[PDB]
Amino acid sequence: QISVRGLAGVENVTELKKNFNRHLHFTLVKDRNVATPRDYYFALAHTVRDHLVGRWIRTQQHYYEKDPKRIYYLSLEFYMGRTLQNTMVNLALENACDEATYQLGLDMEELEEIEEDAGLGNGGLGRLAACFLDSMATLGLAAYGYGIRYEFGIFNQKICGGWQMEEADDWLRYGNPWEKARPEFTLPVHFYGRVEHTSQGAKWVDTQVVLAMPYDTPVPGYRNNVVNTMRLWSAKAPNDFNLNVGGYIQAVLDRNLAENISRVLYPNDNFFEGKELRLKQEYFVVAATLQDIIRRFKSSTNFDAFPDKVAIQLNDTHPSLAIPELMRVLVDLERLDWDKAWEVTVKTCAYTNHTVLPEALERWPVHLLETLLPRHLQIIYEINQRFLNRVAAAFPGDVDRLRRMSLVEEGAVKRINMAHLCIAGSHAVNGVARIHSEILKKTIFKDFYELEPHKFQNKTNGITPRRWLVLCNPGLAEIIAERIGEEYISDLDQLRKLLSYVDDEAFIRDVAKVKQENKLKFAAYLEREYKVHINPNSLFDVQVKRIHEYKRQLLNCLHVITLYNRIKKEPNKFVVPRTVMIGGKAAPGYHMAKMIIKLITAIGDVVNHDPVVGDRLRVIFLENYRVSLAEKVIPAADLSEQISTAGTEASGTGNMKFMLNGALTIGTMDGANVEMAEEAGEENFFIFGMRVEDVDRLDQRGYNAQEYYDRIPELRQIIEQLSSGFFSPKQPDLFKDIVNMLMHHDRFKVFADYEEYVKCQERVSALYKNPREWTRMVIRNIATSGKFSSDRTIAQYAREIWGVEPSRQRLPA
Amino acid sequence: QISVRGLAGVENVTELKKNFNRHLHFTLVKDRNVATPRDYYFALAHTVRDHLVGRWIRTQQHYYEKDPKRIYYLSLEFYMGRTLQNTMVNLALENACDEATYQLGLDMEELEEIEEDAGLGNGGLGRLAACFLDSMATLGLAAYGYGIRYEFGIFNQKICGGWQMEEADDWLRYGNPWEKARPEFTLPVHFYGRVEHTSQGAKWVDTQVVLAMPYDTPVPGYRNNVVNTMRLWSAKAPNDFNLNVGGYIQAVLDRNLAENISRVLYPNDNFFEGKELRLKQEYFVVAATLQDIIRRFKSSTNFDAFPDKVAIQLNDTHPSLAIPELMRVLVDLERLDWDKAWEVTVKTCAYTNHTVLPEALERWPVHLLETLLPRHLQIIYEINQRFLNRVAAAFPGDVDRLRRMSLVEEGAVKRINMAHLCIAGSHAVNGVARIHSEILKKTIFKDFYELEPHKFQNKTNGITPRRWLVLCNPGLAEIIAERIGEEYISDLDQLRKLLSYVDDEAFIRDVAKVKQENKLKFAAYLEREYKVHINPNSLFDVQVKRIHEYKRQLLNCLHVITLYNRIKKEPNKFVVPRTVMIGGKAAPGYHMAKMIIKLITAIGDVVNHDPVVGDRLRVIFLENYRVSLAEKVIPAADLSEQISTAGTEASGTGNMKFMLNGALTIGTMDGANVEMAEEAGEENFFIFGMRVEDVDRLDQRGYNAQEYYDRIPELRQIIEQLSSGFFSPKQPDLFKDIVNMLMHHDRFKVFADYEEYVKCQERVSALYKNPREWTRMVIRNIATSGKFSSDRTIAQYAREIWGVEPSRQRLPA
Ligand SMILES: O=C(NC(=O)c1ccc(Cl)cc1)N[C@@H]1O[C@H](CO)[C@@H](O)[C@H](O)[C@H]1O
Numbered sequence A, B: 001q002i003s004v005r006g007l008a009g010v011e012n013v014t015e016l017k018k019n020f021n022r023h024l025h026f027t028l029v030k031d032r033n034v035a036t037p038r039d040y041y042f043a044l045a046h047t048v049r050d051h052l053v054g055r056w057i058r059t060q061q062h063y064y065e066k067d068p069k070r071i072y073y074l075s076l077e078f079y080m081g082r083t084l085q086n087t088m089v090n091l092a093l094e095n096a097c098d099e100a101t102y103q104l105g106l107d108m109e110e111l112e113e114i115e116e117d118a119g120l121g122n123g124g125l126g127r128l129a130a131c132f133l134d135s136m137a138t139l140g141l142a143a144y145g146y147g148i149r150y151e152f153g154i155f156n157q158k159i160c161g162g163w164q165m166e167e168a169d170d171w172l173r174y175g176n177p178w179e180k181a182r183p184e185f186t187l188p189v190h191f192y193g194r195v196e197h198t199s200q201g202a203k204w205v206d207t208q209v210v211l212a213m214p215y216d217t218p219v220p221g222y223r224n225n226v227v228n229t230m231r232l233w234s235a236k237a238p239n240d241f242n243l244n245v246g247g248y249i250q251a252v253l254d255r256n257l258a259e260n261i262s263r264v265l266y267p268n269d270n271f272f273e274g275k276e277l278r279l280k281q282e283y284f285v286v287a288a289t290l291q292d293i294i295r296r297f298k299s300s301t302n303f304d305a306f307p308d309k310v311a312i313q314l315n316d317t318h319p320s321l322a323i324p325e326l327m328r329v330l331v332d333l334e335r336l337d338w339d340k341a342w343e344v345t346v347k348t349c350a351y352t353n354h355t356v357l358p359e360a361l362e363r364w365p366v367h368l369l370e371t372l373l374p375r376h377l378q379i380i381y382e383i384n385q386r387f388l389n390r391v392a393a394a395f396p397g398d399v400d401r402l403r404r405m406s407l408v409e410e411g412a413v414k415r416i417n418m419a420h421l422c423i424a425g426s427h428a429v430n431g432v433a434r435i436h437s438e439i440l441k442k443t444i445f446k447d448f449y450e451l452e453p454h455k456f457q458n459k460t461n462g463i464t465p466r467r468w469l470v471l472c473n474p475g476l477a478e479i480i481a482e483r484i485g486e487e488y489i490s491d492l493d494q495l496r497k498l499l500s501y502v503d504d505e506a507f508i509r510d511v512a513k514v515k516q517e518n519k520l521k522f523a524a525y526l527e528r529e530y531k532v533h534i535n536p537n538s539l540f541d542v543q544v545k546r547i548h549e550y551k552r553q554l555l556n557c558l559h560v561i562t563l564y565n566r567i568k569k570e571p572n573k574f575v576v577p578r579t580v581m582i583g584g585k586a587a588p589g590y591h592m593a594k595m596i597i598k599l600i601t602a603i604g605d606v607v608n609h610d611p612v613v614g615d616r617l618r619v620i621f622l623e624n625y626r627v628s629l630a631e632k633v634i635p636a637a638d639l640s641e642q643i644s645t646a647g648t649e650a651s652g653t654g655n656m657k658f659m660l661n662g663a664l665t666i667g668t669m670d671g672a673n674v675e676m677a678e679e680a681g682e683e684n685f686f687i688f689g690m691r692v693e694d695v696d697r698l699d700q701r702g703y704n705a706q707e708y709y710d711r712i713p714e715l716r717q718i719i720e721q722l723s724s725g726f727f728s729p730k731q732p733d734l735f736k737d738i739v740n741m742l743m744h745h746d747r748f749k750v751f752a753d754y755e756e757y758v759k760c761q762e763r764v765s766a767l768y769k770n771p772r773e774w775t776r777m778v779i780r781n782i783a784t785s786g787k788f789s790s791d792r793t794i795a796q797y798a799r800e801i802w803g804v805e806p807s808r809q810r811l812p813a
């Protein structure tokens, strides 16, 4: 049907149809008479998977023969979403499969909806790892993603009576056609025990053993015949584990205790919790991965060359135990001297930071590490002593610096600061947007920057244009390709060529047409799956991301109520119609975030049923926001809400997805928003609110929310409505916690940006009244989104951190 | 190579080779350079599995169109062993696959050894279910085996310092290529809750739900293109199960509690234990199975026709809850009146008993059923009242009969007698050998036989000649086929034709040659896998079965020590050399059985290292006895030990396996031994010991073991050796429990049969000295083993219980 989806040749279509029929028969053991739609999905998945196999085997043999430097991306999260369509895109199989299935009397889009998301992440950090894997394969890097195969990913969110309910994400229930178990590469991981000192150094003895069994998933590059590997570890009890009838039975049932390590993803993305099971998960991935790395390195004695053949990237501090684990292996097992082992470790490891909020930073209680990992604690203490010796030599007499920089934090409970461990043991430390990286050097890591300035870098985040344009928005991809060709898909900077089409009447009409089509489709999705009705002609005002106080869904809520109150005051006055959509999951233990979700639904309950409002304002909570839902809502959006308090959102990546898909942005100068505005031009962005410097000024003076309440009558009205029970008539004091926080302990200064926000929103509505000028500004955004391709990000990591050159060259098919 | 293994046609071999290469590439994602022997096994398994698929789909569609009466075999145990070779045998693919793999440079026998046993049973009862499935498919019956998919089957047995150690049988670790998950047929099972009475009858409410997910395994008939189904249920928690971060995490981890139902096979085959988890297993299989049966019946309103289209066979009392569960569904859900529901239930269900030992009978505490299954307890009480009303009418004034026959047993704890439930609710009750069925009518079920004589039947056990001749002993199968053709494989009575070859010099030599070859192969197996050395020219004296006091491995031990002591007394006297092999697992909580294993190894430790003995006597404990080991040792045996106390072994089936494979039998007149001797002629069996009547006489008088000790000097010597520490020099009193039991509380009268046993063993040695006459008696045994084919057994079940006619006719390929 459309050019960018590839060729549907007679040979290929015939071959796909027969292999589909073969899988339905031999693999699924069904015939057309009893086959369910799910059976048809699996037959298609197996058919597409077959095309990956040859390329997968030949890519891995290519790396063996060429022996390039290998990149190991370590993460506790890989937020992959669905695999079927992505695989078809990267193999140029989409149109062929579409035709093949059509001739069989099936709708491929219907089959695509059956696949479960691989929801092995919380949000931005996990999705970044996924985009990175795609870009690394597309840039021909010998890269491996290493993580945990959780049985249960991020919970499915149900909304019941306006409240979030959590249910288990049993994503493996029907099987996973993409993974391949590799029980032959099973490795032992050790826990507990004690340290014994011999003449020949330290020994870690009397340990409990858990087995790590790998499952491999292929990661296809975009049309370059490269297929890399994501290897996820699963926990298995050894067969003599815990080994009378009651006693025998119990010993077998107790195997669950060991296998619980890989059972479930921790869904807390707001607040670090020092739970033992999470620590076990973190060591489990690190220990199994490093053995695998060393094995591959030896199968190429001389560890001097280790950093020339191995790079390890730490996605946050979650896999930070790689540093003392590498030291443990090199010193205790390989018998290298400390200084040489440390040199190898530093040159091998690099660390990426994703937040400056102190409550999110990992600080493990010493007593936990003492019991679980006694040898690692000893190694950490030795690292600390040697590091602080260097600090004392560089800054003599500065005793407070010594306590500030220590890996060991004193207090009620002694803790290890995992961020300090990562900086000391890495040759590179990076933030994820220019402003974030600068904040790291000026604030929380200032002391470390002064000691070792060369270590600190910036690597601005990106998103893959395969999933986030071609896959989710084929209509937009096609109209662009019609003008400038197909090369932009793996060279996104080429979108700048669209600047010469900003006054092109045909292109203006096409861009606006694609957006309208996307909005109609999404409006239809809402009625079919959720029975909710919306006006497709309204401005689609969208805020989708995890629920956090810092992200300020609450500020959005205040604007919504303002709009509602203004309509009620002057009902017969014209306003630009809006559909306000807010979606995202709250961490199960985060009370305030759960209250914010309830507020959003409560506002909807009032606004959506007021006859005076009509179809001029609608408020919808988007249930179960996840990768597959993002692929639907983002192409449909007109307005992207990126309204975090300046200095709190390290980068954001949702912002980039909206920019690429033809939405305009209302946002603060925070994270990557700053660079987005710089690329597009400030005239083409809706910027409002305090800058980082303004926040700092307010903090020095003291933030008093009452001042704003006193001086802004429209804000006072909203707070009075919330307090008096206007949005909860049967529970008048339901939102008391929210009001109390806003009035007395708001870390994120919601009131301080309120006036500028509402003002800016008026300017948005003004522009939307002029469709041609709205669309011209959209074109200026799409045309300058090139910088935010994760291909650019990965090329910078490769050149400036890993010491490898990317390659766009094809491998033979 | 050999005729019975089928044709190796050019077309087939070429096709097998290419499909093997396809699976190695596409299914296993490997190439020949990195492929392990396990990969090669899986490639072959998938290749053979492909050949089953068409026949499997077309068999099941045939049953839908023809709508015959369906047979449902319910069992908590299916002792299947390996599947690869059995599938090749039944599809006539063995020679073709042998050639295909040979041309690929692989040894198929080596690949066969890689498959894990499906050890989902304890012994005879579980193996009977497996032979039955094979025979039902071979006889063209529309039969389904229903059970539990245990994650862990019977434990692997390790011998450490002469003691049994148990380790988990993680048989699914590498995957199971034979099964197909059917998550679309997942069904809910209810537990706990309470009973509510409405105007419209009883309601079972407030229950906990566990999901039952089916896995289907194909069961091929012998060369008739029939492929039936074994459906095994796996336990799954619902997604809102048990649904704060700690709280959310724990709720997900607690899903293990529900899924523990299908985790492990209970290994206690000696003594009934009323454990809650076992009760849950029993209801789980029954509840899921009956829903599946009813669904299939409705997809053919009128339950009068239910018994015309459905037969349910209960393998022991383990699935006895089918009776009140069927009543529950018919009365509570379908709203049938009690009397009609009961008529349907009785006509549908039949019950097979497997032992008369009281400690093995299921007697569930009422308090357990009260909590777990409150509605079933009510139904059982109602069944009991109505049944006892009939008893009182038939035998007026007989108050003791009423308490004897009650389903409810009074005492310290009230219990439900599950055997009484089964008799009351079944139209047929059978024992498993003629003597056993007679003992049931005369002793434990006498009262029930007097009330309803028509209910009681005999169905003598059998074994499948596919696995237990063609598969394990191809050399013997071939020499038989050379003389009488191939028809005997599915018509074992044809072996009677071999009686005209008893004086045939060529045949005598061939039979003896096959046995010698089998012994050499097994002697080689022992050295390679276990590093133990044996004389292949010695008489192979074998006792393999689960370790039980009633089976009297101890009597065998006494004979061994007698032989040893006689050699030590007269070293330069000639004795027929023997290799005494004893193998079998002990239930983990069975102390005496564990002591018996230690005794056997302790005897071996003395005997095998005595220079005066030389190679004249060897005692070996066969570690980890299981189906695949049985297939190796049975073809190698000369002497089969079947020495249970008369009246204790209901049938035995190991006995029949030895008879078919050319071993002579030393045995008591117990179980099927009686019928074996009747078929072959008493002259051609080594019969010794008390008959059932002699045991009864001794019990009336009182069994005094001291009498035998006092009057038999050779027995006295052995007991003195055991007591004084001759077989345990470092722990002199190690075997005190054994001596004490033998002397003071031996339920099974080991001493009473000792003299006759030793005497009979001398007659065995005498015959073995004359190879030609030994072999002629062997031929007379093989020739009369036809009755003991499970095809004969199943044909009798079909005609006399299920009301269906078997068919040997082919389905189209
Ligand atoms: O998503 C996360 N963090 C988590 O999910 C998280 C997960 C676990 C803990 Cl303990 C803390 C935080 N961080 C985000 O990373 C993105 C990728 O760099 C950034 O765009 C975003 O600013 C940041 O909040």
Ligand SMILES: O=C(NC(=O)c1ccc(Cl)cc1)N[C@@H]1O[C@H](CO)[C@@H](O)[C@H](O)[C@H]1O
Binding pocket: B122, B123, B124, B125, B126, B128, B268, B269, B270, B271, B272, B273, B354, B355, B360, B432, B461, B649, B650, B651, B652, B653, B671
């Ligand atoms: O194997 C068993 N029983 C068990 O495994 C068993 C399993 C569980 C319990 Cl609670 C009790 C016994 N019984 C045997 O059945 C065979 C088949 O009918 C007979 O040949 C044999 O005599 C009998 O002991």
